[PDB]
Amino acid sequence: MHIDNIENLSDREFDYIVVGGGSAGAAVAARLSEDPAVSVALVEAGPDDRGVPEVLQLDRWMELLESGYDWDYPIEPQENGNSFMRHARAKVMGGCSSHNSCIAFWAPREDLDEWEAKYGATGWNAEAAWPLYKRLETNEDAGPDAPHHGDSGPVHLMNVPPKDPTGVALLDACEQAGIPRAKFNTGTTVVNGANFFQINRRADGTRSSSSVSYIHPIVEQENFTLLTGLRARQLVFDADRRCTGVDIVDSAFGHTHRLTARNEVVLSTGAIDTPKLLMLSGIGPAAHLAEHGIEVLVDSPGVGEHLQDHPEGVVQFEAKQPMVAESTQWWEIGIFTPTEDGLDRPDLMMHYGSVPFDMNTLRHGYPTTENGFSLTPNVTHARSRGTVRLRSRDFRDKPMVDPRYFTDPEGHDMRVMVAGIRKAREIAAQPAMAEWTGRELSPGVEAQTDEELQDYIRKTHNTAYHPVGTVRMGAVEDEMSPLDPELRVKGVTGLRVADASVMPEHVTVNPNITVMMIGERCADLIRSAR
């Protein structure tokens, strides 16, 4: 059942409680509920997404930013980046899978094999992931000549139709520039190639969000309880340090209500909110906890550390002809390319947008247009690392989010980003684009030297919206990895984390499908443990 008023819930005890009904959390809860002998509650601060067309219609996603569906986290002042940048985070069923552009990627097998081989996460490799991606998807490319793909999973992936003539021309221009058309999600990593994406969207235009895919079909299921509009402020522990539940607050008076879990609690509130919720519960770096008066239950120096992202630049152009009036999600093509020889993974990815993107360029006086297109390069394996810290002991205060963009000591992130701008301009200047590409609006042709392009990036960069890794899994004996390879929070029992915060290293591609895969794996870890 769906419960949007806690006063309507009489039994507040479950076998499992999943906190956060986002990309991973909806997956974990759906999959746990598949055992009819088990009771599952999924707790979500935002509202039910059922019948909210602004959330369900994928082509409207850009309107969700800074709406009532966005927690809206601005960042701390940036030493070498853009202090005006905001981390949009969805506050609704489905989480960010309910606000995103639905770009859908299997992670490179080389990213996933490294989790085990390089970052200590025993059991986390392509072998473990491959069957989970197949289970989770129904993919338009499924068939006997691509047997890795799923044809029955709840998450529908489809090919973006190549209708946009500017995008067709852009791909022709990539080819002229030495970047061929490539198939995505074949299981072989695209190092140098470009194409229209696969998107996780249904035929009727509805996003195939985690809530749509896993949760709408089971809302009436006997052993499953969905609680929306309720915000976890603290996890509850035994004298034995067994997590026994969560304190949640209603939206009416802000009273606190306790829910109890008999087996496990699963925290899935995402890379920004999960570290905050663990810190509020006494799990985190001891000295940081003490600065806010919080009793330390576990000194877990890695909580809130290792924040990773795909920082993103922009090159905008006037179009010489009318741009498309309709689209799947306005950001329909991706281009991968290496800036260096000998890579098994692209170090640079660019999105092509059939709209101007002047969120961070207008305040610096760059001209804009109502008819143009954007190329947005992003650094796939950024080496900068930031933090998420408490702003106070009050759960209602937004956390301090400091990604430290472009601070890696070797200047890697900034180097790749300058090369991405130069590459975006090289592609837009190919013969196949000559009847599309007008004036470069930003950074503009007066910006040519490494210094000018660095100064532009520092001012105008954005994010792909891919924060990860603030509560990472790692070796049982690594003190900086708050989780063991089974996703259990070290130092307490009965508690696991499953969302983007677990990644020990970012993946090369847009991470959503991977985060749902992480949900699917957590459910299996749980089911096998009992």
Ligand SMILES: *Cc1cc2c(cc1C)Nc1c([nH]c(=O)[nH]c1=O)N2C[C@H](O)[C@H](O)[C@H](O)COP(=O)(O)OP(=O)(O)OC[C@H]1O[C@@H](n2cnc3c(N)ncnc32)[C@H](O)[C@@H]1O
């Ligand atoms: C916001 C964003 C992110 C993505 C795109 C765009 C934008 C604007 N586009 C995109 C993405 N990924 C792709 O692969 N392709 C794309 O085109 N984005 C990133 C991806 O969308 C996110 O990385 C991924 O969903 C993160 O998943 P998650 O780690 O499971 O986190 P969610 O935010 O999905 O779920 C958290 C969930 O918990 C609720 N919450 C937060 N705090 C609380 C508390 N205290 N109590 C209860 N519930 C809480 C949130 O409301 C949210 O629903």
